[PDB]
Amino acid sequence: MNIFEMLRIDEGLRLKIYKDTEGAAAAGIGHLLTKSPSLNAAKSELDKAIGRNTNGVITKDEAEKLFNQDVDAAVRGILRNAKLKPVYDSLDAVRRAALINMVFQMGETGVAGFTNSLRMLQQKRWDEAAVNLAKSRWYNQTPNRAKRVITTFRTGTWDAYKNL
Numbered sequence: 260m261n262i263f264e265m266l267r268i269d270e271g272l273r274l275k276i277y278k279d280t281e282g283a284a285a286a287g288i289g290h291l292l293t294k295s296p297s298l299n300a301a302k303s304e305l306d307k308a309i310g311r312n313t314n315g316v317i318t319k320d321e322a323e324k325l326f327n328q329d330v331d332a333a334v335r336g337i338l339r340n341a342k343l344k345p346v347y348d349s350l351d352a353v354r355r356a357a358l359i360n361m362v363f364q365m366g367e368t369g370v371a372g373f374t375n376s377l378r379m380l381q382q383k384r385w386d387e388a389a390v391n392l393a394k395s396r397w398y399n400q401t402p403n404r405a406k407r408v409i410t411t412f413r414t415g416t417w418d419a420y421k422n423l
Contacts, residue, residue, distance in 0.1 A: 260417040262330060262356040266363055268423050269404050272322060276301050276315045280401055286315075287322030289363065290329060333363040342371040349381050357411040364404075365397065380412065389413040 270289030276298070279285040284292040284301030292304040298315075305313050309321055317325075337343045337358065347358055358380075361370045371377075373395070379388035389409050392398065398405040410419035 260420055262359050263326070265356055265417075265420055266330065266360060267326075268420055269360065269364075269407065272319070274317055274319060274322060276305060286317060286325075288326040288329075290322075290325045329363065330359070333359050333367075336367040337362055340367050340371055342374075342377065343367060346377045346381050349383075351415055353415050353417065354380070354412055357408050360408050360411075361397075385413045385415075 267288060272288050273286065276284055276286045276292065279289070279291070282296075283294045284298070284304075286292055286301075286305055290308070292301045292308070295301065302313070302315050305315065305317065308325060309317060337347050343358070343362070347355055350358065358370070361373075373392065376388050376391045379391060389412060392409050392412065393405070395405075398409070407419040407423075411417065
């Protein structure tokens, strides 16, 4: 199990533009295209991202290419962030993947906002961090995914993804 397999499980794979959990236009493996409600705006962003006229459909190879770029961008996003880098550096390899998962899902700005949880993660207060991470719109909007991520932060193992 690794970060690509983990996010692949949480994001799924769609070879056509689709609305994500929160209405935004997305495609492939959780690749956010636009918050805009325009199907034309989303299509335009997809063509731009892929470099060709997709007409809203992409191949598996293209979904994966976008996926590699997005994971890479999530990591570098974490490493350039003053609030996130310290937390990331203090974590073991499995928990680092959990932090990357969150950033991939809600952006470094959103995650950097989980101030108290980050502090708790830094101090390695796993169970307190888990409780605090659950008191969020994030958890309430996407409970099944949030608990797999929270469980990963709490235990330091891949158990929450093992049964999947």
